[PDB]
């Protein structure tokens, strides 16, 4: 419970991420997990090359879902070429919105 | 990494920057594999020398 | 896997591979047909492949290798023993009848999978084209031509790894260690072949090989010069000639590949 999944997609696929966010969150809602934030940090340059690219599109997301949606998202990112990196996390607390993008601009 | 403005100033800034960043003593510590016993020897000896210095300086601070 | 007590001289080193997941007899009769035992003899009657003879009566299983049925989910009924293979076979049941035998993956005990196209890319046993799978996956039963059927990695415990994809070919590393390019539209099955414990086995006695169908093999040094190139001599001769096949082919370390048609499809030789 109370995950903070962060994943970044290919720069060429940044246009399609709007539908992908809903495509992933619909399964979480079907499982029964509410989503507390959905932030798109935008296009930024990487600190190093990941499969010979330098841009990406970070997508921040925090979820409170059972073990089934966790496994669903653990498998969906693996079998995708758009998603190049991911990091599932765990926090024993709630979620507040608008963390740092206001300061990052 | 050092950019450029006389050349001697750049040379000295490169030499000092490399020493401050490291990557010159570490290379010298990559030419022979010290066993973890020898590595714990460094940790014991440096700790003894650093803790002893903190007490020896107090004698000067009397 | 079990071990036999030395009750008799023949049981001292018998290592059996027992399983309780196999069904107790009664195979699906419609998918069985008779097979005669060749004995290593072609239509001329001459022995071509020697060291074959005897054995036990067996029925050939119509094992499905194409998996042409796409989209229809399938449910496993049971896993059965296949006399003419080292791996186990699983009996399927699609949404409307049409029971089939396939090479059982490591998935067992009434699993459900859909041999289809781009559907269900996760579970092992799913057959799909080689183009739409992630690199680095382990596959088995790889066909070399479209519609021919699975050819490579069908024995027990065998598999192959995906390593690259470019153009119409998808390179993969075989279990032998030989890199090979295969066409992208060729189907393959995710996972590993079931009976990985086959390598841990000891037949135990001389008679254990005779009901496998293999006839005893006789060395060349125990023959006369007329029979074998190694020939006879006085005492236990040291095989004074170089090691050689009965028909005069070098045995210890001589290449014998002369295809010269499919060499372009091989990236790296096994070494």
């Amino acid at each position: 419970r109370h995950y903070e999944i962060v994943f970044l997609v290919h720069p060429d696929q940044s246009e399609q991420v709007g539908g992908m966010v809903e495509r992933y969150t619909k399964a979480i809602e079907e499982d029964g997990g509410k989503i507390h934030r959905l932030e798109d940090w935008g296009r930024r340059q990487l600190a190093y090359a990941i499969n010979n690219v330098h841009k990406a599109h970070y997508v921040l997301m925090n979820v409170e879902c059972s073990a089934k949606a966790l496994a669903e998202l653990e498998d969906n990112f693996r079998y995708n070429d758009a998603v190049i990196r991911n990091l599932v996390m765990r926090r024993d607390e709630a979620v507040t919105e608008q963390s740092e993008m206001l300061k990052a601009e | 990494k050092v950019k450029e403005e006389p050349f001697d100033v750049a040379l000295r800034r490169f030499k000092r920057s490399c020493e401050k960043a490291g990557v010159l003593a570490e290379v010298r510590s990559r030419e022979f594999y010290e066993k973890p016993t020898a590595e714990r020897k460094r940790k014991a000896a440096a700790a003894v020398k650093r803790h002893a210095k903190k007490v020896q300086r107090e004698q000067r601070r009397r | 896997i079990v071990k036999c007590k030395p009750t008799s001289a023949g049981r001292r080193f018998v290592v059996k591979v027992v399983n309780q997941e196999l069904h107790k007899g009664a195979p699906y009769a419609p998918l069985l047909e008779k097979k005669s035992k060749s004995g290593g003899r072609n239509n001329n009657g001459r022995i071509t492949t020697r060291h074959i003879g005897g054995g036990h009566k067996q029925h050939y299983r119509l094992v499905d290798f194409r998996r042409n049925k796409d989209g229809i989910p399938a449910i496993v009924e049971r896993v059965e023993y296949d006399p003419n293979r080292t791996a186990h076979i699983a009996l399927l049941k699609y949404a409307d009848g049409e029971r089939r035998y396939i090479i059982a993956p490591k998935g067992v005990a009434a699993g459900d999978q859909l041999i289809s196209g781009i559907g269900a890319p996760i579970k092992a046993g799913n057959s799909m084209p080689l183009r739409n799978i992630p690199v680095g996956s382990t596959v088995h039963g790889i066909e070399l031509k479209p519609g021919k059927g699975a050819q490579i990695a069908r024995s027990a415990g065998a598999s192959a790894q995906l390593v690259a994809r470019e153009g119409a070919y998808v390179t993969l590393r075989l279990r032998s260690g030989e890199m090979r390019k295969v066409l992208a539209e060729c189907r393959a099955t995710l996972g590993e072949v079931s009976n990985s414990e086959h390598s841990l086995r000891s037949l135990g006695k001389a008679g254990a090989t005779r009901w496998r169908g293999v006839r005893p093999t006789v060395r060349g040094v125990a023959m006369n010069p007329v029979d074998h190139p190694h020939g006879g001599g006085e005492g236990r001769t040291s095989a004074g000639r170089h090691p050689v096949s009965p028909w005069g082919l070098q045995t210890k370390g001589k290449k014998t590949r002369s295809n010269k048609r499919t060499d372009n499809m091989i990236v790296r030789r096994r070494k």
Partner: protein, 115 residues
């Protein structure tokens, strides 16, 4: 053939110094080593040999121009900085000096210790 704004690579071991002049594509143009200057011994490891090799490499590089250089120093041995002072003496504008060094985070274990 004319190329400008090359990259100078310096590989300085404990027994030799190798100087190579390249471009942004990393294509070799002129290379010189301390052993080729004719030292072959304890004199080979001195930083003066790195200066002789560096200035010899800086003479064949003028065949293609290269009025601007980028220096990449590499290795712990002597002549790490002495070779750099032998570059601009030949009349090259050195834009930047960069430390490139293989530093394993854990890496393979190195050889055994001498006795």
């Amino acid at each position: 053939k004319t190329v400008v704004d090359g990259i100078a690579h310096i590989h300085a071991s404990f027994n030799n110094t190798i100087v190579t002049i390249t471009d942004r594509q990393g294509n070799a143009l002129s290379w010189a080593t301390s052993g080729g200057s004719g030292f072959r011994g304890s004199r080979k490891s001195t930083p003066f040999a790195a200066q002789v090799a560096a200035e010899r490499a800086g003479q064949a590089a003028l065949e293609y121009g290269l009025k601007n250089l980028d220096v990449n120093v590499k290795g712990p041995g002597p002549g790490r900085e002495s070779a750099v002072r032998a570059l601009n003496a030949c009349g090259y504008k050195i834009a930047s000096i960069t430390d490139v060094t293989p530093i394993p985070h854990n890496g393979c274990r190195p050889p055994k210790k001498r006795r």
